[PDB]
Amino acid sequence: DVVVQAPTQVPGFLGDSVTLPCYLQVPNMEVTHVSQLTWARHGESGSMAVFHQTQGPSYSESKRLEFVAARLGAELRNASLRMFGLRVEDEGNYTCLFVTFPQGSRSVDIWLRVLAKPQNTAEVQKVQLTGEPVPMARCVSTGGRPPAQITWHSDLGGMPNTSQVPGFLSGTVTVTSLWILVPSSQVDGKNVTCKVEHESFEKPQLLTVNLTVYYPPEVSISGYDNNWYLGQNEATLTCDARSNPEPTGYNWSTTMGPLPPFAVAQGAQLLIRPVDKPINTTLICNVTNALGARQAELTVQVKEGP
Numbered sequence: 037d038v039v040v041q042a043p044t045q046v047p048g049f050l051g052d053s054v055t056l057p058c059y060l061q062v063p064n065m066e067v068t069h070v071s072q073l074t075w076a077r078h079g080e081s082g083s084m085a086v087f088h089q090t091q092g093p094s095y096s097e098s099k100r101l102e103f104v105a106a107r108l109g110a111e112l113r114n115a116s117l118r119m120f121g122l123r124v125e126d127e128g129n130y131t132c133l134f135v136t137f138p139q140g141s142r143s144v145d146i147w148l149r150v151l152a153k154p155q156n157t158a159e160v161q162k163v164q165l166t167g168e169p170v171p172m173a174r175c176v177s178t179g180g181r182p183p184a185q186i187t188w189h190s191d192l193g194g195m196p197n198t199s200q201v202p203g204f205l206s207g208t209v210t211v212t213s214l215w216i217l218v219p220s221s222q223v224d225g226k227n228v229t230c231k232v233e234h235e236s237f238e239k240p241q242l243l244t245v246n247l248t249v250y251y252p253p254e255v256s257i258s259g260y261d262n263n264w265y266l267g268q269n270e271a272t273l274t275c276d277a278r279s280n281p282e283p284t285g286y287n288w289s290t291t292m293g294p295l296p297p298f299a300v301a302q303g304a305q306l307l308i309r310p311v312d313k314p315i316n317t318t319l320i321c322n323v324t325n326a327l328g329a330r331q332a333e334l335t336v337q338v339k340e341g342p
């Protein structure tokens with residue numbers, strides 16, 4: 037049997053042109069004569085484009101529709117129809133029928149999904165250390181049709197607030213989602229990914245932001261295993277501090293005021309010389325960064341033992 041052959045859905049680009057494919061499978065066993073072929077919009081009191089074996093083409097508005105393959109004189113099989121300058125009002129279900137003989141007339145329906153491919157951004161909104169959940173990263177898919185779907189993925193999930201204004205071309209929408217979280221030191225420099233999903237992309241398109249949080253120094257001192265003894269070799273402690281932006285000043289002092297002679301400060305580190313006689317000092321690393329100045333404590337002992 038003679039059967040008509042066409043996609044169930046066709047995208048579909050605003051302001052572009054598409055080809056609607058429509059083709060007649062005709063098992064080489066049996067013969068048929070196809071007289072004409074008619075594209076019609078859905079229930080429009082009649083046809084939108086019609087081609088004929090001998091009489092040729094005829095269009096509703098000639099300037100915007102064109103039969104791609106159908107050629108005069110030839111045996112008609114390929115109803116494929118190209119229409120230019122898609123607008124929103126061009127979306128709809130279109131029928132394509134062939135007028136054969138002696139089979140009759142076989143037709144199929146094509147959904148013409150017209151859509152617009154948005155493109156998208158993400159920035160990081162730099163945040164201070166407010167108590168409140170604030171926008172820390174923004175994502176924005178401008179000019180979507182249908183609107184894009186914006187989801188966030190990351191190791192530290194927050195609270196996404198999404199919204200959308202009409203887009204540029206009629207029928208488009210630009211979605212602006214922002215990723216709201218209660219800011220905190222340990223998220224600075226961490227990764228948050230915006231996923232913009234849309235039925236026009238090759239694949240969900242992934243946009244990734246480098247979070248930024250400014251904060252005062254968080255300070256601690258490493259370098260001490262409790263077994264420091266008299267006459268050991270120069271052991272040196274680091275004043276680890278993680279701040280944003282990077283710390284500007286390091287200052288070494290003791291709980292007693294001035295550093296003991298044996299402990300010579302070297303920038304962000306304290307060199308601990310050999311000791312002649314046992315000492316205690318609790319040490320203070322006062323770290324100044326662009327935002328404030330914090331400090332950390334450490335009691336350290338040197339004995340004889342073994």
Ligand SMILES: *[C@@H]1O[C@H](CO[C@@H]2O[C@@H](C)[C@@H](O)[C@@H](O)[C@@H]2O)[C@@H](O[C@@H]2O[C@H](CO)[C@@H](O[C@@H]3O[C@H](CO)[C@@H](O)[C@H](O[C@H]4O[C@H](CO)[C@@H](O)[C@H](O)[C@@H]4O)[C@@H]3O)[C@H](O)[C@H]2NC(C)=O)[C@H](O)[C@H]1NC(C)=O
Nearest residue numbers: 044045078079125126127128129130145146147148149150
């Ligand atoms: C192009 O053609 C498709 C194909 O389906 C068919 O052609 C249509 C024009 C129409 O004549 C259909 O009846 C016909 O089978 C169209 O897409 C279909 O549209 C129908 C009706 O609008 C949709 O029906 C809905 O189906 C949903 C699940 O698939 C269901 O959840 C919906 O339920 C809700 O609405 C119904 C009333 O419709 C209501 O009773 C319920 O209580 C509930 O609210 C609804 O039944 C189908 O989804 C679509 N079918 C397919 C296969 O996708 C399409 O609309 C048309 N193109 C354009 C641009 O309009």
Ligand SMILES: *[C@@H]1O[C@H](CO[C@@H]2O[C@@H](C)[C@@H](O)[C@@H](O)[C@@H]2O)[C@@H](O[C@@H]2O[C@H](CO)[C@@H](O[C@@H]3O[C@H](CO)[C@@H](O)[C@H](O)[C@@H]3O)[C@H](O)[C@H]2NC(C)=O)[C@H](O)[C@H]1NC(C)=O
Nearest residue numbers: 291311312313314315316317318334335336337338339340
């Ligand atoms: C370095 O400092 C230690 C003591 O370290 C301790 O912790 C500090 C943060 C301070 O709070 C110190 O006061 C505290 O002791 C010096 O050795 C310590 O000396 C004191 C006596 O002056 C010892 O007191 C004893 O307390 C224990 C119970 O906790 C009793 O059993 C004893 O009878 C005695 O009363 C203290 O134990 C002792 N610490 C140790 C580990 O033995 C140390 O002298 C000083 N460095 C030097 C050599 O000058």
Ligand SMILES: *[C@@H]1O[C@H](CO)[C@@H](O[C@@H]2O[C@H](CO)[C@@H](O[C@@H]3O[C@H](CO)[C@@H](O)[C@H](O)[C@@H]3O)[C@H](O)[C@H]2NC(C)=O)[C@H](O)[C@H]1NC(C)=O
Nearest residue numbers: 041055056057058059060103104105106113114115116117
């Ligand atoms: C029925 O006819 C239509 C129109 O002639 C056919 O559609 C298009 O035909 C062209 C040329 O054969 C295909 O393109 C060729 O492919 C590359 C890309 O793949 C393209 O860049 C060049 O134009 C190249 O010559 C094109 O893929 C095809 N378009 C579609 C939507 O299929 C159609 O193939 C015919 N249908 C059947 C069932 O025979």
Ligand SMILES: *[C@@H]1O[C@H](CO)[C@@H](O[C@@H]2O[C@H](CO)[C@@H](O[C@@H]3O[C@H](CO)[C@@H](O)[C@H](O)[C@@H]3O)[C@H](O)[C@H]2NC(C)=O)[C@H](O)[C@H]1NC(C)=O
Nearest residue numbers: 160223224225226227228244245246247248279280281282
């Ligand atoms: C997010 O972006 C920030 C930058 O805007 C990244 O910070 C950078 O982190 C790297 C190490 O992860 C630092 O690089 C190291 O720099 C030293 C020199 O100081 C060099 O010797 C090493 O070879 C290495 O390159 C880099 O300094 C730092 N950038 C700045 C401007 O301070 C951060 O890593 C990113 N985080 C994520 C999760 O993507």
Ligand SMILES: *[C@@H]1O[C@H](CO)[C@@H](O[C@@H]2O[C@H](CO)[C@@H](O)[C@H](O)[C@H]2NC(C)=O)[C@H](O)[C@H]1NC(C)=O
Nearest residue numbers: 170171195196197198199200212213214215216
């Ligand atoms: C998502 O965020 C928007 C924008 O910040 C919120 O819209 C606010 O809604 C509150 C409560 O209804 C109003 O008092 C404000 O005036 C709105 N702010 C702005 C800037 O328009 C909205 O509350 C959030 N939506 C959801 C579902 O959580």
Ligand SMILES: *[C@@H]1O[C@H](CO)[C@@H](O[C@@H]2O[C@H](CO)[C@@H](O)[C@H](O)[C@H]2NC(C)=O)[C@H](O)[C@H]1NC(C)=O
Nearest residue numbers: 190191225226227228229242243244245246247
């Ligand atoms: C954080 O995100 C950055 C991008 O901002 C990721 O960097 C990409 O890393 C891969 C290899 O892992 C490279 O192939 C790409 O070229 C990088 N992108 C850019 C723009 O340079 C990074 O992998 C992420 N890291 C974490 C821990 O999330």
Ligand SMILES: *[C@@H]1O[C@H](CO)[C@@H](O)[C@H](O)[C@H]1NC(C)=O
Nearest residue numbers: 285287322323324329330331
């Ligand atoms: C830490 O250093 C800064 C920079 O000079 C100083 O002004 C501040 O008062 C210091 N704070 C303490 C507790 O030492």
